[PDB]
Design an enzyme around this catalytic site. Structure first.
Site, PDB file in Angstrom:
ATOM      1  N   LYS A 115      -2.606  -7.329   5.073  1.00  0.00           N
ATOM      2  CA  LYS A 115      -2.287  -5.930   5.374  1.00  0.00           C
ATOM      3  C   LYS A 115      -2.556  -5.593   6.835  1.00  0.00           C
ATOM      4  O   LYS A 115      -1.890  -4.740   7.422  1.00  0.00           O
ATOM      5  CB  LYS A 115      -3.190  -5.024   4.521  1.00  0.00           C
ATOM      6  CG  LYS A 115      -2.911  -5.104   3.024  1.00  0.00           C
ATOM      7  CD  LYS A 115      -1.533  -4.593   2.673  1.00  0.00           C
ATOM      8  CE  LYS A 115      -1.358  -4.586   1.177  1.00  0.00           C
ATOM      9  NZ  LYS A 115      -0.013  -4.098   0.799  1.00  0.00           N
ATOM     10  N   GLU A 131      -2.330   5.347   2.064  1.00  0.00           N
ATOM     11  CA  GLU A 131      -2.798   5.158   0.699  1.00  0.00           C
ATOM     12  C   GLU A 131      -3.423   3.775   0.560  1.00  0.00           C
ATOM     13  O   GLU A 131      -3.068   2.869   1.324  1.00  0.00           O
ATOM     14  CB  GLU A 131      -1.637   5.254  -0.305  1.00  0.00           C
ATOM     15  CG  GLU A 131      -0.686   4.035  -0.337  1.00  0.00           C
ATOM     16  CD  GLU A 131       0.122   3.681   0.910  1.00  0.00           C
ATOM     17  OE1 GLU A 131       0.396   4.563   1.738  1.00  0.00           O
ATOM     18  OE2 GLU A 131       0.523   2.536   1.039  1.00  0.00           O
ATOM     19  N   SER A 145      -2.849 -14.140  -0.066  1.00  0.00           N
ATOM     20  CA  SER A 145      -2.677 -12.903   0.684  1.00  0.00           C
ATOM     21  C   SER A 145      -3.997 -12.258   1.075  1.00  0.00           C
ATOM     22  O   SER A 145      -4.037 -11.503   2.058  1.00  0.00           O
ATOM     23  CB  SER A 145      -1.701 -12.021  -0.070  1.00  0.00           C
ATOM     24  OG  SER A 145      -2.240 -11.682  -1.332  1.00  0.00           O
TER      25      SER A 145
END
Ligand SMILES: O=P(O)(O)OCCNS(=O)(=O)c1ccc(OC(F)(F)F)cc1
Ligand SMILES: C=C(/N=C/c1c(COP(=O)(O)O)cnc(C)c1O)C(=O)O
Ligand SMILES: c1ccc2[nH]cnc2c1
Ligand SMILES: c1ccc2[nH]cnc2c1
Ligand SMILES: [Cl-]
Ligand code: NA
Lengths: 393, 267
Positions: free
Chosen positions: A86, A108, A376
């Site tokens: 991210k 969010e 990830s």
């Protein structure tokens, strides 16, 4: 009128209240401009390299493929600063925010990785950050709440609806529709209204570009398949993008099967939902017969979302990518297996991708196959969740 | 022709329109029908009626809670269409506009949705999360079934948007008082005179101002600013919420408020 195509086939679009269209048009123009700007590209590359730690390793599994004809590599996004992929696109969107003269960020989060990435980038680049997080996720991913707050972000529990990612998304969008003059909405997946699915893909595509270079260096050929979990779609499209025109390379996305598709408690709209319009986009979603949006479920907060980004729905429809599901128990077994046999603690989200690769190996153990799993994120945020469950068993 | 007829009558009378919003089925089907009859009896010129939706992204907490109340009563879109048919059968000339979210219109086919609206005698549909840029199948289906598609003129509207809204919309033009989401606690601006003026220049459907309108003063001010009328939702819904245990007092206080708001529309 847009500079770029807002659709992937039938999917995507800009299904927001009219008030927000100038903001989305502004963002699109600033992205197109940035993508051509060598100074922006140099700033972004510098942050990725010297702040975030790119390129990330590509690790060959030593033990988990023993006695099979599978070779398995893990793309180590768990080694990125902040602990997940991210961080890549947040650095890009933060620079866009500055470019547009915004001073505040709204994000969010569900797993809290996107919130952590948004808060760290806001702290570095001098933006005031507020994060919406469903109250259920505040509990099951609490280490991340602590990290966001220490970094100066305001964290706002959302008690509405399922109290999970969808509800956080709703509140972030409601906020933005009043605050767009001064706040950038740092959407944290490859979903939502155009131009976010496009921007997020382009600011995540280094995952697949590095993977391609790394596998060519180590193996002298492309992978047979690259495998990634799909919650909204960012880590998966970031791994898939540079391989889309390599038609020999399989693109496998893994949705959460929850307690089992047949229970209705899952997060797998791409394969088990129906096209609808919500969160700014025309996309597959879990919905009632009457068109109300359902609540999703997954053990993993970061996959607990009842829609999916429109580029994945498109890639599925044309047959370029295949999508499957993995249940909570399958994810838990893959988590345990990676910790004990490779010494890596993966996020529960990423454990869904690993579980499907383990199935590909175990079901056909004499099939020769070269696989990459996008790892990830790291699983520090999940250790309390998983601990509880294993002890109980 | 219900909006056209209304605005012609109001113009003759030198009056603005006062248009309450409520959620259909809040706090139950029977009480909602009585609420709506009370609103009309108290002087509502038109209605804006919400169909309960799971995730109403243009709405603040007051109307979020109206939706949740309707769901708690088991209200579905099908039940809303039965209500609408009953409302029209009682009230042949009042304009009835629905506030929809796109998924509920798209769900069983866009065409089918507008055809159902025509069958029950709805006059207009505002799809809150479909901007003019994505409106083509919605506006086409609306006009094919004699429904007015409502479009929004936000405070940030440019000339291209003004021209599109004027061209594509029918019935009335929604003049947004402010950014943000619905709510009585966030007072909007006075109608932008320049926007009202440009809309008239472009022969747009008459403007109704909405969002944050909660007092007779604001209604009067919209009229003076040149809008054809004003919409109030959260303020009306607050009266329902406050009086859930006292249904008679609920209707009395709704009548008082609506009458006062309508009285302020008289110039
Ligand atoms: O008085 P308030 O502040 O509650 O406002 C009530 C408005 N109710 S409504 O159906 O007109 C209405 C109109 C438009 C909406 O969103 C959109 F602008 F994006 F289209 C939402 C509700
Ligand atoms: C919900 C969140 N994260 C999701 C996530 C996901 C799923 O999101 P994408 O589908 O956008 O990659 C995958 N892997 C990791 C490590 C994640 O943290 C979040 O961090 O807010
Ligand atoms: C380029 C630019 C704008 C577009 N809108 C739709 N497709 C497009 C391609
Ligand atoms: C799905 C939906 C929204 C998200 N924000 C961050 N990760 C997500 C996954
Ligand atoms: Cl009473
Ligand atoms: Na999902």
């Amino acid at each position: 009128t847009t500079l770029l195509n807002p659709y992937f086939g039938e999917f995507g679009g800009m299904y927001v209240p009219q008030i927000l269209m100038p903001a989305l048009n502004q963002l699109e123009e600033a992205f197109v401009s940035a993508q051509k700007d060598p100074e922006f590209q140099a700033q972004f590359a510098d942050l990725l390299k010297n702040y975030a730690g790119r390129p990330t390793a590509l690790t060959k599994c030593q033990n988990i493929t023993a006695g099979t004809r599978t070779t398995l590599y893990l793309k180590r996004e768990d080694l990125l600063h902040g602990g997940a992929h991210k961080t890549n696109q947040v650095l890009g969107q933060a620079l866009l925010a500055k470019r547009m003269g915004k001073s505040e960020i709204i994000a969010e989060t569900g797993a809290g990785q996107h919130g952590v990435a948004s808060a760290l980038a806001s702290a570095l680049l001098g933006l005031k950050c507020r994060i919406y997080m469903g109250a259920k996720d505040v509990e099951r991913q609490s280490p991340n709440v602590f990290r966001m707050r220490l970094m100066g972000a305001e964290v706002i529990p959302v008690h509405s609806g399922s109290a999970t990612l969808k509800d956080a998304c709703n509140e972030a969008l409601r906020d933005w529709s009043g605050s767009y003059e001064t706040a950038h909405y740092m959407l944290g997946t490859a979903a939502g209204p155009h131009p976010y699915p496009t921007i997020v893909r382009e600011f995540q595509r280094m995952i697949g570009e590095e993977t391609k270079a790394q596998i060519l260096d180590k193996e002298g050929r492309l992978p047979d398949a690259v495998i990634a979990c799909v919650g909204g779609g960012s880590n998966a499209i970031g791994m898939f993008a540079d391989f889309i025109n390599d038609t020999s390379v399989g693109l496998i996305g893994v949705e959460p099967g929850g307690h089992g598709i047949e229970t209705g408690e899952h997060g797998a709209p791409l394969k088990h939902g129906r096209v609808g319009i919500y969160f700014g986009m025309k996309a597959p979603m879990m919905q009632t017969a009457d068109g109300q949006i359902e609540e999703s479920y997954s053990i993993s907060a970061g996959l607990d979302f009842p829609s999916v980004g429109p580029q994945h729905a498109y890639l599925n429809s044309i047959g370029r990518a295949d999508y499957v599901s993995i249940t909570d128990d399958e994810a838990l077994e893959a988590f345990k297996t990676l910790c004990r046999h490779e010494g890596i603690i993966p996020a529960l989200e990423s454990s869904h991708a690993l579980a499907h690769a383990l199935k590909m190996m175990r079901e056909q153990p004499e099939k020769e196959q070269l696989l990459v799993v996008n790892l990830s994120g790291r699983g520090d945020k999940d250790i309390f969740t998983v601990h509880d469950i294993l002890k109980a068993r | 022709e219900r909006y056209e007829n209304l605005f012609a009558q109001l113009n003759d009378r030198r009056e603005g329109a006062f248009v309450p919003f409520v959620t259909l089925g809040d706090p139950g089907i029977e009480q909602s029908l009585k609420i709506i009859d009370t609103l009309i009896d108290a002087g509502a010129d038109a209605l804006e009626l919400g169909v309960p939706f799971s995730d109403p992204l243009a709405d603040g907490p007051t109307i979020q809670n109206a939706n949740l109340r309707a769901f708690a009563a088991g209200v579905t879109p099908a039940q809303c269409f039965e209500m609408l048919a009953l409302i029209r059968e009682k009230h042949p000339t009042i304009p009835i506009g629905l506030l929809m979210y796109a998924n509920l219109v798209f769900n069983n086919g866009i065409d089918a949705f507008y055809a159902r609206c025509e069958q029950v005698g709805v006059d207009s549909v505002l799809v809150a999360d479909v901007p003019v840029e994505e409106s083509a199948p919605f506006r086409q289906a609306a006009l094919r079934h004699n429904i007015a598609p409502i479009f929004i003129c936000p405070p940030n509207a440019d000339d291209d948007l003004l021209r599109q809204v004027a061209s594509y919309g029918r019935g009335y033009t929604y003049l947004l008082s402010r950014s943000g989401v619905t709510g009585a606690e966030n007072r909007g601006a006075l109608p932008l005179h320049h926007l009202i003026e440009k809309l008239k220049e472009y022969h747009a459907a008459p403007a109704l101002q909405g969002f944050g309108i909660s007092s007779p003063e604001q209604v009067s001010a919209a009229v003076r600013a040149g809008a054809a009328g004003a919409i109030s939702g959260s303020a009306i819904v607050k009266i329902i919420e406050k009086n859930l245990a006292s249904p008679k007092q609920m209707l009395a206080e709704l009548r008082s408020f609506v009458s006062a708001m309508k009285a302020a529309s008289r110039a």
